[PDB]
């Protein structure tokens, strides 16, 4: 491992693995998986019903005190029965550590709002609802935050087209801005960049 390769830290790896097993032992009702990545990032995969308990634990336990919510977001994977995965990034200042909590939902299953655990979640949840269509139960005021008023659809979904469905212009007959079906003078050029000849043998999937 000469100067072009990123150095690795075994002590942090061991510490994060130990804390992951600790968390899993404490909350076996909700934890389904624990992982530590090769660049020393710990993630915990939980059942959706445990969003409020688990987070509360990680915020209030003396051995965790993850008091900061760094980020809350969603990822859309159409091939899964539960389309959306919800990712919470937490920072602990007492122990100078970071953790990630993942759960899942589909287009019709509500997720509990975590504003009672972290005040920062409020706008984040709004953003998720705006961009993916995930509903959060018991949210103080859930509504659109990024899209235009009356905008239809959720643009961060994979099946949503890049340029959308409508475009805006000014019309002098009705003397106002109007929305019309989108027409592009130059269509966006789709590129097929992926090569054959797989790059990484370590991630090869079984040929099933």
């Amino acid at each position: 491992t000469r100067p072009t390769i990123r150095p690795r830290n075994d002590v942090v790896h061991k510490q994060l693995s130990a804390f992951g097993q600790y968390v899993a032992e404490i909350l076996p009702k909700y934890v389904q998986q624990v992982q530590v990545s090769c660049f020393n990032e710990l993630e915990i995969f939980i059942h959706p019903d445990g969003v409020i308990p688990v987070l509360t634990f990680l915020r209030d336990h003396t051995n965790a005190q993850f008091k900061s919510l760094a980020d809350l977001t969603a990822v859309d994977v159409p091939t899964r029965q539960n389309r959306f995965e919800i990712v919470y990034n937490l920072l602990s200042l007492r122990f100078n550590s970071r953790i990630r909590v993942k759960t899942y939902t589909d287009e019709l299953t509500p997720i509990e709002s975590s504003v009672t655990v972290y005040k920062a979640a409020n706008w984040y949840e709004r953003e998720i609802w705006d961009m993916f269509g995930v509903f959060f139960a018991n949210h103080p005021d859930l509504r659109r935050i990024l899209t235009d008023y009356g905008f239809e659809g959720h643009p961060f979904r994979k099946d949503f087209p890049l340029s959308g469905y409508v475009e805006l212009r000014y019309d002098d007959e009705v003397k106002r801005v109007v929305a019309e079906p989108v027409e592009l003078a130059q269509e966006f050029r789709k590129f097929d960049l992926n090569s054959p000849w797989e790059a990484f043998p370590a991630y090869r999937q079984p040929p099933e």
Binding site: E187, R189, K190, F191, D192, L193, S195, P196, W197, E198, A199, P201, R204, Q205, P206, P207
Partner: protein
């Protein structure tokens, strides 16, 4: 059973004896690097890129050529195999030219990709590189031999697949060069495939040069309509324009190859195109007009005449949707004269029994036959991929081939029995010793071409072939569902038309001349204005201006096969659909939509309004047209053979002479080919060569 156990990176797998290390690694999901190895070519072992380590063996082995042994543990990602790959790539790149920005294989190069995946990222070659002179092998394959890496894929393909021994290596050592050693054009119906098999930019497509990059193109998986094989293809498009045609893999039809016509005749889609409706002006000249006017003029005559006064002829590139739409439109006026240009004898069963006009053995079944008899056909130019399958079976299965007809060159040695149709009678009687040859066979095959059916002896020829097949089945017994009898077709629209109830041939027009005539892409010229009464109303619907358009009163511009989702049935009886690659130019429309709009304007509205409803109608008329990869069917040979013995038409004293006598007759066969400038270049090159 007899399977042996081997290990790939410690994972157990059972393989058949004689399996190579490369195939065992394939069974696990690992693709070994390769340059010279190809699945459909013979093993070479030159490039040494497949070298891999076997556990507890000091020397690496060539995975493409070495059979695996019981207990072997193949280490695909071991340090020794990685270093072997790096060294081989270093040697390959030492003399390679820095041509990537000007090389047409830039974004789709196996050399580039395997260098990025398995080689080093830098060079330590401090010498000058070798440069060789380019060779000229015709107007289709552009040659830049400094990019050659000497994998000998083209030589093996030319010798084994194409049956042409023109390519070789001259010289020795570092200056050993691939070529012909003399000024010689490599001309064959399958010559363009060496572009695809060549891993580098040494061999490229000349008409495609410098037009696109592989990352810009959009891929449409579709069907070729240049013959009746139905080879699967990929149309490459960019910004609404067709750029090139590539083969799409289908193990049962064309494996991995296409014909030179299929590959290069797309040039003709850009010339002599029909773009707007046209009508005759007061001077008598064709002038542009709207869809409303042309459709109203056609509908007025469709309303004025009925019964046997209305007729239609279907050309060679017509889809099943348009065929059934025109048939319904003419039935609504009480007309039954729905004809095709290609003649099939209607005596006996005719088109009532499907197996009477199909390649019942199927294309793949040729690999199971041990004897084949060709009657009055040139499969080399009528059905190049069928002939390639015959060549493959001849090479690998020791297939015996005999031919009735002119002694054409088929790229393999066959037994010429003669030129006279009466020879069939002798074989049908048992005097000829080839009757004894066919009697001893376990899987005999008799193939009769439609070109021998067009010669007005078609009834007698078909009866003689059926008699031979019946004698085979009666003497050798029923081996199984082997389906000896076969009919090899030439045009892509014939089987669908016969399935839908079109009368084969144009004799019904001659018997009862019509006063309104529909030409659905008909460009064979078998009907002239002389064979029709004065002031006959002729409508031409199609996509090209050819012999069919200038004789018409109204021109309705249709869509080509790259511009619609359409159903075609190949010579086996297998239905396949194309997809829309681009849209029709100008005011041209989908053909079934044209017929439906005409029916609505004429007061005879057809029940269907969408493509799905047209396919439902197709299912109602012939339900095999909506099963899109199925080839299996019933065998009614006994009924057809019993019905073929009623009429006793005599044979002519006229030798069977196929229309495609030599390669110069292969390039121009349809309106798209005749508009192709590349086909014109090919004809010029083969007629006079430089």
């Amino acid at each position: 059973s007899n399977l042996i156990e081997v290990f790939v990176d410690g994972q157990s797998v059972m393989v058949e004896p004689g399996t190579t290390v490369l195939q065992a690694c394939e069974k696990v999901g690992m693709q070994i690097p390769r340059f010279c190895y190809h699945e459909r070519l013979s093993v070479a072992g030159n490039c040494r890129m497949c070298l891999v380590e076997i556990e507890k063996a000091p020397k690496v082995v060539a995975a493409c050529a070495m059979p695996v042994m019981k207990g072997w543990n193949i280490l695909t990602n071991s340090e020794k195999s990685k270093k072997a790959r790096e060294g081989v790539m270093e040697f390959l790149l030492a003399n390679h030219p820095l041509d990537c920005p000007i090389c047409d294989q830039g974004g789709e190069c196996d050399l580039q990709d395997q260098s990025m995946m398995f080689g080093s990222d830098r060079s330590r070659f401090l010498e000058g590189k070798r440069a060789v002179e380019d060779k000229n092998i015709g107007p289709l394959v552009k040659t830049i031999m400094t990019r050659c890496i000497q994998c000998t894929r083209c030589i093996r393909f030319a010798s084994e697949i194409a049956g042409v021994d023109d390519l070789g290596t001259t010289g020795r050592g570092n200056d050993m060069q691939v070529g012909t050693y003399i000024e010689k054009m490599f001309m064959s119906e399958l010559s363009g495939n060496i572009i695809d098999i060549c891993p580098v930019g040494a061999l490229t497509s000349k008409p495609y040069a410098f037009t696109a990059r592989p990352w810009e193109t959009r891929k449409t998986e579709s069907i070729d309509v240049m013959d009746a094989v139905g080879s699967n293809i990929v149309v490459s498009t960019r910004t609404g324009e067709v750029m090139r045609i590539l083969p799409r893999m289908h193990e049962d039809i064309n494996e991995e190859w296409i014909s030179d016509k299929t590959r290069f005749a797309y040039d003709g889609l850009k010339r002599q195109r029909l773009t707007q409706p046209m009508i005759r002006n007061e001077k008598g000249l064709l002038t542009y007009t709207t869809w409303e006017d042309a459709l109203s003029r056609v509908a007025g005559m469709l309303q004025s005449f009925q019964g046997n006064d209305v007729a239609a002829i279907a050309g060679g590139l017509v889809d099943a949707e348009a065929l059934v739409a025109l048939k319904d439109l003419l039935n609504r006026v009480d007309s039954d004269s729905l004809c095709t240009e290609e003649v099939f004898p209607t005596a006996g069963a005719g088109t009532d029994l499907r197996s009477n006009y199909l390649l019942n053995t199927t294309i793949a079944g040729v690999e199971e036959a041990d004897v084949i008899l060709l009657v009055g056909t040139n499969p080399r130019f009528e059905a190049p991929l069928f002939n390639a399958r015959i060549r493959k079976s001849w090479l690998h299965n020791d297939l015996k081939v005999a031919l009735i007809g002119s002694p054409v060159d088929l790229t393999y040695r066959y037994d010429h029995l003669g030129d006279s149709p009466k020879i069939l009678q002798d074989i049908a009687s048992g005097n000829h010793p080839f009757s004894q040859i066919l009697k001893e066979a376990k899987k005999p095959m008799v193939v009769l071409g439609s070109s021998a059916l067009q010669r007005s002896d078609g009834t007698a020829i078909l009866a003689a072939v059926s008699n031979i097949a019946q004698n085979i089945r009666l003497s050798s017994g029923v081996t199984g569902d082997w389906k000896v009898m076969n009919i090899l077709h030439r045009i892509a629209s014939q089987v669908a038309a016969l399935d839908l109830g079109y009368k084969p041939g144009v004799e019904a027009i001659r018997k009862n001349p019509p006063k309104v005539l529909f030409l659905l892409g008909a460009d064979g010229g078998c009907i002239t204005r002389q064979d029709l009464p004065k002031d006959c109303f002729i409508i031409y619907q199609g996509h090209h201006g050819d012999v069919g358009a200038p004789m018409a009163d109204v021109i309705l511009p249709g869509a080509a096969y790259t511009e619609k989702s359409a159903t075609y049935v190949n010579t086996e009886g297998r239905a396949q659909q194309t997809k829309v690659a681009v849209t029709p130019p100008g005011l041209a429309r989908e053909d079934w939509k044209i017929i439906r709009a005409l029916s609505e304007i004429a007061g005879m509205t057809l029940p269907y309004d969408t493509l799905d409803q047209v396919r439902s109608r197709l299912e109602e008329v012939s339900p095999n047209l909506v099963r899109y990869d199925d080839v299996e069917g019933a065998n009614y040979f006994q009924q057809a053979n019993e019905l073929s013995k009623l009429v006793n038409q005599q044979l002519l004293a006229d030798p069977l002479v196929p229309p495609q006598l030599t390669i110069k007759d292969f390039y121009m066969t349809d309106s798209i080919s005749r508009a192709s400038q590349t086909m014109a270049k090919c004809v010029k090159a083969v007629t006079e060569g430089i």
